[PDB]
Amino acid sequence: TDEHLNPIRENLGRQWKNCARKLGFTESQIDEIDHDYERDGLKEKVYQMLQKWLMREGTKGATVGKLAQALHQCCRIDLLNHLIRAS
Amino acid sequence: TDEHLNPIRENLGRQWKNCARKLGFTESQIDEIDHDYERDGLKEKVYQMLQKWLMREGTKGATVGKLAQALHQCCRIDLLNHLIRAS
Amino acid sequence: TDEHLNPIRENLGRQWKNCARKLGFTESQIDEIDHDYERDGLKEKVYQMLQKWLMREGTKGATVGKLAQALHQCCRIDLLNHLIRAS
Amino acid sequence: TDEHLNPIRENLGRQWKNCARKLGFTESQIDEIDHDYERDGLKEKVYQMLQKWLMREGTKGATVGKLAQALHQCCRIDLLNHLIRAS
Amino acid sequence: TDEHLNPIRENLGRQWKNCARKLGFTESQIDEIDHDYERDGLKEKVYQMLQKWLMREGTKGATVGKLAQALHQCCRIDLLNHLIRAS
Amino acid sequence: TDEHLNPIRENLGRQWKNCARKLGFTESQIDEIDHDYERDGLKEKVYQMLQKWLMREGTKGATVGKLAQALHQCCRIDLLNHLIRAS
Amino acid sequence: TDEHLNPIRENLGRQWKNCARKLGFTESQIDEIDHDYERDGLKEKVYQMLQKWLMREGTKGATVGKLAQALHQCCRIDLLNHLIRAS
Amino acid sequence: TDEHLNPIRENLGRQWKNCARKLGFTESQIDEIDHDYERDGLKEKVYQMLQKWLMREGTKGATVGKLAQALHQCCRIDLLNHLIRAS
Amino acid sequence: TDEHLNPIRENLGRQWKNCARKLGFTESQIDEIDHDYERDGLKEKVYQMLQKWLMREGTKGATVGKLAQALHQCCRIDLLNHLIRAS
Amino acid sequence: TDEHLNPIRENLGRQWKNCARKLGFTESQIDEIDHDYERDGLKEKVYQMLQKWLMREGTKGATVGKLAQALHQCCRIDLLNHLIRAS
Amino acid sequence: TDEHLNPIRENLGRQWKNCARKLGFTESQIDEIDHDYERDGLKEKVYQMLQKWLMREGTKGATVGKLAQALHQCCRIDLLNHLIRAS
Amino acid sequence: TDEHLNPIRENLGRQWKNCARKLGFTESQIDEIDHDYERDGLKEKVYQMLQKWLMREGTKGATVGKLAQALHQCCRIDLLNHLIRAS
Amino acid sequence: TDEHLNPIRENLGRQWKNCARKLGFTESQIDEIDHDYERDGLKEKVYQMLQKWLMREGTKGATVGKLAQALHQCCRIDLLNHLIRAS
Amino acid sequence: TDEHLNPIRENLGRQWKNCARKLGFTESQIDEIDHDYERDGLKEKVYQMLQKWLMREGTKGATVGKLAQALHQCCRIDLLNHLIRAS
Amino acid sequence: TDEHLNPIRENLGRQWKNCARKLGFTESQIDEIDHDYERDGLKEKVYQMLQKWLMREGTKGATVGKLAQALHQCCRIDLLNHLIRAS
Amino acid sequence: TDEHLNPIRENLGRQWKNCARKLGFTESQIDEIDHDYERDGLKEKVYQMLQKWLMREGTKGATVGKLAQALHQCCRIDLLNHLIRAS
Amino acid sequence: TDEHLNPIRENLGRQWKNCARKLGFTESQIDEIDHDYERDGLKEKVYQMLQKWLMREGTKGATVGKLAQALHQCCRIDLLNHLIRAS
Amino acid sequence: TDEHLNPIRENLGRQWKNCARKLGFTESQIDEIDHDYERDGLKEKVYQMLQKWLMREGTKGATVGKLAQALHQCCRIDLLNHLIRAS
Amino acid sequence: TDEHLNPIRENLGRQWKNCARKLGFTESQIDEIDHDYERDGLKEKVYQMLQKWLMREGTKGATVGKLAQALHQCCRIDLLNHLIRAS
Amino acid sequence: TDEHLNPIRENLGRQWKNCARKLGFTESQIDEIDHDYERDGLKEKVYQMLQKWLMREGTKGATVGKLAQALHQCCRIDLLNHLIRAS
Amino acid sequence: TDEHLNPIRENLGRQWKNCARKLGFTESQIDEIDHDYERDGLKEKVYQMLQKWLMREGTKGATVGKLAQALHQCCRIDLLNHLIRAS
Amino acid sequence: TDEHLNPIRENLGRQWKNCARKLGFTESQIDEIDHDYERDGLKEKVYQMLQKWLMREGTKGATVGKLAQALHQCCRIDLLNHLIRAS
Amino acid sequence: TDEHLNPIRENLGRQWKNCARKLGFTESQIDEIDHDYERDGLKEKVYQMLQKWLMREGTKGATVGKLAQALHQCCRIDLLNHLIRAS
Structure with a gap:
C-alpha cells in the first residue's frame, strides 16, 4: 500500500544500491535505474x-x-520497523 | 475482454518496447508502432x-x-497479477 | 456470405493496403481503390x-x-478467427 | 443541444482517440475518422x-x-463539469 | 409520408452508400445511383x-x-429517432 | 455586394467548414458542398x-x-475587419 | 484561474514528478507526460x-x-504560499 | 505588415507554444497547430x-x-525589440 | 522554359510552402494547392x-x-544556382 | 479573331469557372455551361x-x-500575355 | 499493339500525370483527362x-x-522494361 | 521476385531513409515518399x-x-544475407 | 529576500550538512542534495x-x-549576526 | 555582437549556474536549461x-x-575583461 | 539466435560503449545510439x-x-562464457 | 560532391549543433532541424x-x-583533413 | 529521540571507533564510515x-x-550518564 | 556463487586496492573503480x-x-578461510 | 578585523588546545579541529x-x-598585548 | 592509428586533466569532458x-x-615509450 | 601568461590554503576548492x-x-623570485 | 574469539612493536600500522x-x-596466561 | 618488471620521502603523493x-x-641488493 511504502521511499537514501541488491536486482537493473x-x-x-x-x-x-x-540484510531495518510497528 | 486488458493498457507505460519484444513483436513492428x-x-x-x-x-x-x-519475462507481472487475482 | 464478411468489412481498418497485397491485388489496383x-x-x-x-x-x-x-499473413487473424470460431 | 456540445467540440483536443474509445467507438471507426x-x-x-x-x-x-x-473515464471531466455546472 | 421522410432526405448526407447497403441495395444499384x-x-x-x-x-x-x-445498422439512428420520437 | 464579399471568397481558405458551421449550415449541406x-x-x-x-x-x-x-465566432475576423474598416 | 496557477507553472521546476505523484498521477501518466x-x-x-x-x-x-x-506534501509550499498569501 | 512580422516568424523557434499561450491561444488551438x-x-x-x-x-x-x-511575458522580447527599434 | 524549370520542379521538395510564400502566394492559394x-x-x-x-x-x-x-529568400538557391550557372 | 482566341481556348483548363466569373458570367450561366x-x-x-x-x-x-x-484578375495572364506579346 | 500496351495500361497507376507530362501532354490536356x-x-x-x-x-x-x-524520364521504366525484354 | 523482396519489405524498418539514399533516391524523392x-x-x-x-x-x-x-553500405546486410543465403 | 540570504549562501561552506540538520532536513534529503x-x-x-x-x-x-x-545551534551565528546587525 | 559574446560562450564552463543566477535567471529557468x-x-x-x-x-x-x-559578481571577470580590454 | 543473445542483452549494462567500440562501432554510431x-x-x-x-x-x-x-577485449567475458559453456 | 561529403555526414556526430552554428545557421534553423x-x-x-x-x-x-x-572553428578538422588530404 | 542522542553526537569525539566496536560494528563498517x-x-x-x-x-x-x-564498555559513560540522569 | 562471495564483499574493506592489485587489476582499472x-x-x-x-x-x-x-598474497586470507572452511 | 587577528593566527602555535579550552571550545570541537x-x-x-x-x-x-x-587565562597575553598596545 | 592509441586510452587514468592541459585543452573543454x-x-x-x-x-x-x-611534460612518458619503442 | 604561472602551479604544493588566503580567497571559496x-x-x-x-x-x-x-606574505617567494628573476 | 582477544587488545600497550615482531610482522608492516x-x-x-x-x-x-x-617470546605472557587459565 | 619491484614496494616503508627525493621527485610531487x-x-x-x-x-x-x-644514496640498498643478487 501507499502508506506501507511511503516512509521507505522517503527515508531510504544513499543505500539504495545495497537495498536493491538485497531485493534481487541484478547489476544491470541497478545500472539502468542509475542511468535512466x-x-x-x-x-x-x-x-x-x-x-x-x-x-x-x-x-x-x-x-x-x-x-x-x-531490509534486515541491508541493515536498513529502521524503515520498516518504525513504519509498521510504531504506527 | 475489455476488463481483462484495460489495466494493462492504462498502467504499462515506458516499458512497452520490452513488453512488445516479449510478446513476439519483431523490431520492424515496434518501429512502426513507434513511428505511426x-x-x-x-x-x-x-x-x-x-x-x-x-x-x-x-x-x-x-x-x-x-x-x-x-509479462513475467517483461518483469511487469504487477499488471496482470493485480488485475486478475486481486479482482 | 454477408455474415461471413460483415465483420471483416467493419473491423479491418487502416491495414487495408496490406490485406489487399496479401490477397493478390497489384499495386495499380490498390491505387485505383485508393483514388476512386x-x-x-x-x-x-x-x-x-x-x-x-x-x-x-x-x-x-x-x-x-x-x-x-x-489474413494470417496480414496478421489480422482476429477478424476471421473471432467471426467463424467464436460464432 | 448546440450549447451543451460546443465547449466539448472546441476544447477537447489531442485526447479525441481516448474519448472516442470511452464513448464506444471501435478501432475501425477511429481509423475512419482519422483517415477521412x-x-x-x-x-x-x-x-x-x-x-x-x-x-x-x-x-x-x-x-x-x-x-x-x-468524460470521467477519459479524465476530461473539465469540459462538461465547467460547461454544465459553471453556466 | 412526406413528413416521415423529409428529415432523412435532408440530413442523411455522406453515408448514403452505407445506408443503401443496409437497406438492401445491391452494389450495381448503388453504382447506378452514383452514376446517373x-x-x-x-x-x-x-x-x-x-x-x-x-x-x-x-x-x-x-x-x-x-x-x-x-438506420440502426447504418448507425444513423439520429435521423429517425429525432424525427419520430421528438416530434 | 461583390466588393464586400470578394476578399472573404479569396482569403477564407481551409477553415471553410468551420465558417459554414458558424453560418448556420447543417452537416448535410457541408457534405454536399464538399462532395459536389x-x-x-x-x-x-x-x-x-x-x-x-x-x-x-x-x-x-x-x-x-x-x-x-x-466570422468572429469562426475566429476569421481578419477578413471582414480588414475589408470593411481598412477600405 | 490563470493568476492562481501561473506562478506554479513558472516556478515549479525539477520536482514536477514528485508534485505529480502527490497530486494523484499514476506512474504511467507521469511516463506519458515525460515522453510526449x-x-x-x-x-x-x-x-x-x-x-x-x-x-x-x-x-x-x-x-x-x-x-x-x-504542495505541502511535495514540500513545494513556497509556490502557493507566496502566490496566494503574499498577493 | 510583412516586414513587421517576418523576423518574428523566422526567429521565434522552439518557444512557439509559450508564445501562443501568452498570445491567448487555448490549449486545444495549440494542439491543432501542433497536429495539423x-x-x-x-x-x-x-x-x-x-x-x-x-x-x-x-x-x-x-x-x-x-x-x-x-513577447515580453514570453521572454522573447529580442524579436520585436530588435526588429522595430534597431531598424 | 522547360529546361530552366525542370530541376526546380524535380528538386524543390518539402519547402514548397516557404518557396510559395516567397513567390507571392497568399495563404489561401497555398491552402488550395495543398488541398486540391x-x-x-x-x-x-x-x-x-x-x-x-x-x-x-x-x-x-x-x-x-x-x-x-x-529562391534566395527561401534559402533554396542551390536549385537555380546549379541549373543556370553549372549548365 | 481565331488566332487571338485559340490559345485561350486550348490552354485555359480547370480554371474556367473562375475565368467565367471574372468575365461577368452569373452563377446560373456557369451552371448551364457545366450542365449542357x-x-x-x-x-x-x-x-x-x-x-x-x-x-x-x-x-x-x-x-x-x-x-x-x-485574365489578370483570374491570374491566368500567361494566356494572353504569351499569345499577344510573344507572337 | 495491344500486347505492347496492355501492361502499361494495367500497371501504370498513380503516376499518370507525370507520365503524361513526360509524353508531351499540356496541362490543359491533363486537366481534361482528369475531369472527363x-x-x-x-x-x-x-x-x-x-x-x-x-x-x-x-x-x-x-x-x-x-x-x-x-517512361525512363518518368522513372516508370519497369513497365516497358519488363514487358518487352522479359517477354 | 516476391520471395526475394518480402523479407526486405517486412524487416527493414526505421532505416528506410538511409537505405533509400544508398539506393540512389534523391532527397526530393524521399520527401515525396515521406509525405504521400x-x-x-x-x-x-x-x-x-x-x-x-x-x-x-x-x-x-x-x-x-x-x-x-x-544494403551493405546501409549496414542492413542482415536482410539479404539471411534471406538469400539462409534459405 | 536576496540580500538577507546572499551572505549565508556565499559564506556557509563545509558545515552545510550540520546547518541542514539544524534546519529540519532529514538524512535522506541531505543525501539527495549531496548526490544530485x-x-x-x-x-x-x-x-x-x-x-x-x-x-x-x-x-x-x-x-x-x-x-x-x-544558525545559533549550528554555531554559524557569524553569518546572520554580521549580515543583519552590521548592515 | 558575435565577437563580444564568443569568448564568454567558449570559456565560461562549469560556473554557468552561478553566472545565470547573477544574470537574473530564476531557479526554474536554470532547471529548464539543465534538463533540456x-x-x-x-x-x-x-x-x-x-x-x-x-x-x-x-x-x-x-x-x-x-x-x-x-560577471563581476560571478567572479568570472576574466572573460569580459580579456575580451573587451585586451582586444 | 535469441537464446545466444538474450543474456548479453539483459546483463551487459553500463559498459555498452566499450563493448560497442570493441565490436567495430565508430564514435558517430555510438553517438547515434546514445542520442536516439x-x-x-x-x-x-x-x-x-x-x-x-x-x-x-x-x-x-x-x-x-x-x-x-x-567480449574478451571488453573484459565482459562473463556474459558469453556463462551463457554458452554453462548451459 | 558525394565523396567530398559522405565522411562528414557519417562521422560528424554529436557536435552537429556547434558545426551548424559555425556554418551560419541561426538558432531557429537549428531548432527546426532538431524538431523535424x-x-x-x-x-x-x-x-x-x-x-x-x-x-x-x-x-x-x-x-x-x-x-x-x-570545421576548423568547430574543432572538427579531422573530418575534412582526413577525407581530402589522406585520400 | 533527538534529545536523547544529541549530546552523544556532539560530545563523543575521537573515541568513535571504540564506541562503534562496542556497538557491534564490524571492521568493514568502521572502514566505510571512515572512508565515506x-x-x-x-x-x-x-x-x-x-x-x-x-x-x-x-x-x-x-x-x-x-x-x-x-558506552560503559567504551568507558564513555559520561555522555549518557549526564544526559539522562542530570536532565 | 552468492554465498561464496558475500563475506568477501562485506568484510574486505580498506585493503581493496591491494586485493585488486593481487587480482590482476591494472592501475587504470583501480583508478576507474575509485573514481566512478x-x-x-x-x-x-x-x-x-x-x-x-x-x-x-x-x-x-x-x-x-x-x-x-x-587473498593469500593480499594477506586477507581470513575472508575465504573462514567462509569456505568454517561453513 | 584581519589586522586584529593576523598576529594571533601567526604566532599562537603549540598552545592552541589550551587557548581553545579557554575560549569555550568543548573537547569534541578540539578533537574535530585536530582531526579534520x-x-x-x-x-x-x-x-x-x-x-x-x-x-x-x-x-x-x-x-x-x-x-x-x-589569552590572559591561556597565559598567551603577549599576542594581543603586543598587537593592540604596541601598534 | 588504433594500435598507436589503444595503450594510451587504456592506461592513462587519473592524470587525464593534466594530460589534457599539456595537450592544449582549455579549462572549459576539460569541464565539458568532465561534465558530459x-x-x-x-x-x-x-x-x-x-x-x-x-x-x-x-x-x-x-x-x-x-x-x-x-606526455613528457605530463610525466606520463611510460605510455608512449612502452607502446612505440617496446613493440 | 602560461610561462609566468607554470612554476607556481607546479611547485606551490601543500601551502595552497595559505597562499589562497593571502590572495583574497574567503574561507568558503577555499572549502569549495578543497571539496570539488x-x-x-x-x-x-x-x-x-x-x-x-x-x-x-x-x-x-x-x-x-x-x-x-x-607570495611574500605567504612566505613562498621562492616561486616567483626564481621564475621571473632567474629566467 | 572476541573473549579470547579482548584482554590482549585492551592490556597490551606500549610493547605492541615487540609483540608484532614476535608475531611475524615485517618492519614495513609495523611502519604502516604506526603511520596509518x-x-x-x-x-x-x-x-x-x-x-x-x-x-x-x-x-x-x-x-x-x-x-x-x-606472547612468551614477547615476555607479555600475563595477557594470555591470565585470560585463558584464570577464566 | 613486477618481480623486480614487488620487494621494493612491500619493504620500503617509512623512508619513502627520502627515497622519492633521491629518485628525483620535487617537493610538490611528494606533497601530492602524501595528500592524495x-x-x-x-x-x-x-x-x-x-x-x-x-x-x-x-x-x-x-x-x-x-x-x-x-637506493644506495637513500641507504636502503637492502631492498635491491637482496632482491636481485640473492634471487
Missing part, C-alpha cells in the same frame, strides 16, 4: 527501485515478510 | 501494441496464459 | 477491396481457406 | 467524433449522463 | 436512394420498422 | 459556401452584422 | 502536468485546498 | 501560430502593443 | 505551385531575376 | 464559355482590354 | 492518357523508342 | 521505397548485386 | 540547501527568527 | 544560457555594463 | 547496439567467435 | 544540416574553403 | 556512526539499555 | 572490484583457487 | 580554531575584551 | 579527451612527436 | 586556486605585483 | 596489529598455541 | 611513489642502475 533517472536525482532512483521491485514481484511477492528480510 | 503513433503519444503506442498483439493472435492465441508469461 | 473512393472514406475503400476480391475470385476462389491464409 | 478528415485537421476530427456519437446514440442515448461518464 | 445523378449532386443521390427504396418496397415494405432497423 | 465541388477545388467550395449562404439568407439576412458575428 | 513533451522541454512538462490535473479534477476538484495539501 | 502542421515542420507551426493570431485579432487587435506585451 | 492535389502527392503540389506562379506572372513577370530572388 | 456540355468534356465547356462571352459582348465588348483585365 | 473521366476512375484516366497519346502521335510517332524515353 | 504515405504508416513508406526502386531500375537494374551493395 | 549536485560543487549544494529550506517553509516559515535559531 | 540540453552537453547549456539572457533582455538590456556587472 | 534511444533508457541502448551489430555483420559476421573476441 | 527529424535520429539531423547548408549556399558558396574554415 | 565521510570531518563520522546504529537496530534494538551498556 | 563509485562509498568500490573480477575471468577463471591465492 | 586539519598542519589548526571562535561568537561576542581575557 | 561523460566513467573521459585531441589536430597535428612531447 | 577537486588531487586544487584567482582578478588585477606581494 | 593509525592513538595501533595478524593467519593460523608462543 | 593517498595508507603512498617514478622515467629511464643508485 540520473536527470531526476536520488529520490527518483529510490522511488523507481521500489516501484520496479513491486512490478517484478506482483501482489504475490510484494509481501511484508520479504521486504522485511531484505 | 508518435503524434498521439505513449498511451496510443501502448494501446496499439496490445491491440496489434490481439489481432495477430486472434482468439486462439490471445490467452491469459501467454500474456502472463510475456 | 477517396471521396467516400476508408470504410468504402475497405468494402470495395473485399468486394473486388470477391469479384476476382468468383465462387471458386472466394473460399474461407484463402481468406484465412491472407 | 486528415485533410481538415484535428478540429474536424473532434467535431466528427462527437457528431458520429450523436448519430449512433440518437436522442435516447445522447444523454448527459453517458457523456459525463465517458 | 452525379450531375445533380449528393442531395439528389440521397433523395433517389430513398425514393428507389420506396418503389422497391411498395407500401407493404416501406414500414417504419424496417427503416428504423436499417 | 471536389472536382473544382477548395476555391470553388469556399465560393459556393458563401453563395449558398447568400441564397439562404436573401437580402434580409445577408447583412454585415450576421456575417461579422459568424 | 520531451521535445518541448521541462516547462512544457510542468505546464501539462498542471493542465492534466485540472482536466482530471474538473472544477469540483481543482480547489485551492487540495493543491495546497499536495 | 506536423508534416511541414516547426517553421510552419510558428508561421501558422502567428497567422492565426492575426486572423483572430483582425486589424483592431493585431497591434504592436499587444504583440510586444505577449 | 493531396491525392496526387508532393510532386504534384510542387509542380502546380510553379505552374500557378507562371500563370500569375505571365511572360513579363516569370523572369529569372525574380525566381532567383525568391 | 458535361457529355462533351472540359474542352467543350471552356470553348463554350469563351464563345458565350463573345456573343454576349458583341464586337464592341469583345475587346482585348477587357479580356486582358479579366 | 473522373466518373470512371483512375484506370479509365490511364487508359485514355495512353489512347490520346496514340491518337496524337499516329503510327509515325507511337514508337517504342519514344515511349521508352518517356 | 504518412497516412498509411512506416510499412507503406518502406514498401513504396522498394517498389519505386524497382520501377526506376526496371528488370535490368533490379539485380541482387546492386541491392546487396546498397 | 555533486557535479556542480559545494557552492551548489549550499545554495540548494537554502533554497529547499525556503520552498519547504514557504513565506510563513522562512522567518529570520527560525534561521537565526538554526 | 542534457543530451547536448555543457557547451550547449552555456550557449543557451547566454542566448536566453539575450532574448530576455532584448537590445535595450543586453548591454556591456550589465554583463560586466553580472 | 535516450528516451527509452539503457536497456534499449544495449539492445539496439547488439541489434545494429547483427545487422551490420549479417549472418556471415555475426559469429560466436567474433562476439567472444569482442 | 527527431523521429529519424541523429544521423538524419546531421545529414539534413549538411544538406540545408548546401541548399543555402548553392554552388557558389558550397566551397571546400568555407567548409574547412567552419 | 572523510571529506566532512569527525563530526560527520560520529553522527553517521550513531545513525547507522539506529538504522541497524530499528526501534526494538535502539534501546537506552544497550546504548548504556555499549 | 566515489559517490556511493567504499562498499560500492569493493563490490564493483569483485564484480569486475568476475566479469573479466568469466566462469573459467573465477575459481576458488585463484581467489584463494590472491 | 591534520593533513594541513598546525597553522591550519590554529587558523580554524580562531575562525570557528569567530563564527560561534558572531560580531556580538567576538570582542577584544573576551579574547583578551581568554 | 560523468555518467559513463573515467574510461570514457580519457577516451573522449584523446578523441577530441585527434579531431582538433586533424591528421596534420595528430603526430607522434607532439603526443610524445605532451 | 578532492577526487583529482592536490595538483588540481593548486591549479584551480590559481585559475580562480585569475578569473576573479581579470587582466587588470592579475598583475605580477599583487602575486609577488601575496 | 597515528591519528587514532595507541589503542587503535594495538587493535589493528592484532586484527591484521588475524587476517594474515586466517582461522588455520590464528591458534592459541602460536599466540601463546609469540 | 592519505586515505589509503603508507603502502599506497609507497606504491604510488614507485609507480609515478616508472611513469616519469618510461622504459628508457626505469633502469636497474638508476634505481640501485637511488
